[PDB]
Amino acid sequence: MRGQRGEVEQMKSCLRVLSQPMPPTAGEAEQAADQQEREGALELLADLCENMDNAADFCQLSGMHLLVGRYLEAGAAGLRWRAAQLIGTCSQNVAAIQEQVLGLGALRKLLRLLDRDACDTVRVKALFAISCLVREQEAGLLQFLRLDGFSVLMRAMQQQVQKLKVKSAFLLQNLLVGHPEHKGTLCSMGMVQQLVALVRTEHSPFHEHVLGALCSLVTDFPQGVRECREPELGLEELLRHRCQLLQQHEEYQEELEFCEKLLQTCFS
Numbered sequence: 001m002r003g004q005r006g007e008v009e010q011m012k013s014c015l016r017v018l019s020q021p022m023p024p025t026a027g028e029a030e031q032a033a034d035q036q037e038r039e040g041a042l043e044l045l046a047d048l049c050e051n052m053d054n055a056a057d058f059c060q061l062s063g064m065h066l067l068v069g070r071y072l073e074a075g076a077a078g079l080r081w082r083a084a085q086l087i088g089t090c091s092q093n094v095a096a097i098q099e100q101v102l103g104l105g106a107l108r109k110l111l112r113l114l115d116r117d118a119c120d121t122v123r124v125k126a127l128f129a130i131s132c133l134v135r136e137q138e139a140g141l142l143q144f145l146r147l148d149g150f151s152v153l154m155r156a157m158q159q160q161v162q163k164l165k166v167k168s169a170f171l172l173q174n175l176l177v178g179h180p181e182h183k184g185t186l187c188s189m190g191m192v193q194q195l196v197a198l199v200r201t202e203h204s205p206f207h208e209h210v211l212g213a214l215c216s217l218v219t220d221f222p223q224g225v226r227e228c229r230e231p232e233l234g235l236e237e238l239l240r241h242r243c244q245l246l247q248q249h250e251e252y253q254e255e256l257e258f259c260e261k262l263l264q265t266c267f268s
Contacts, residue, residue: 018038042071052094056097084129087101087129098136101133114130153172158198169213195213239259
């Protein structure tokens, strides 16, 4: 094992707490206390797993098996979000762990969390882990696509909490830059229409990424341009009007530039 002796013992002690059964018959005070103990073990493991050596030990001790298998579907929100966070921490920019986590069925569970969870903290941490597994990882992206993850990402962007809609839009934008092979499928899914609909909501920083994503989909891509030109969409007017609104807020220059590329590309 790669970690120092003290770190390994912390890790093993934490895994022991987390590996214990939920209190078989319990009252209120003992459930809460038990939950706190587990939340605390999850945080200590995350502190440790920021370091790549420790995260690899974590995997070797079957810690990912425990997190996917039990904690992503834990009854308590505080456990689910901390489990998703830990997944993301271990896997961020370590290809071998990403592949391990993907092989354990984490993407399906994580996408369910992002799409369905009552807790907003759970949704955001699930999106973080997903971004960690899917970006630099072609097999994870292929699985994400088959699990309908782009639709889950769109619903997150349609929803009302702005940290979450900004984070999802940023991830789509990133995926479109790094994975131009998928532009055809997303256009065929009606993504141009869905994204333009977002451009018509109340203006905010969110729109920059929405419009950046639209830019990718028309660049070197005739189907994307055709969808953009559809008369019922009303895109041209929406863009000309946006350009005029942003032309004097310099803090929106990036959004303005996406708007002007789209006009130039699609409307002469």
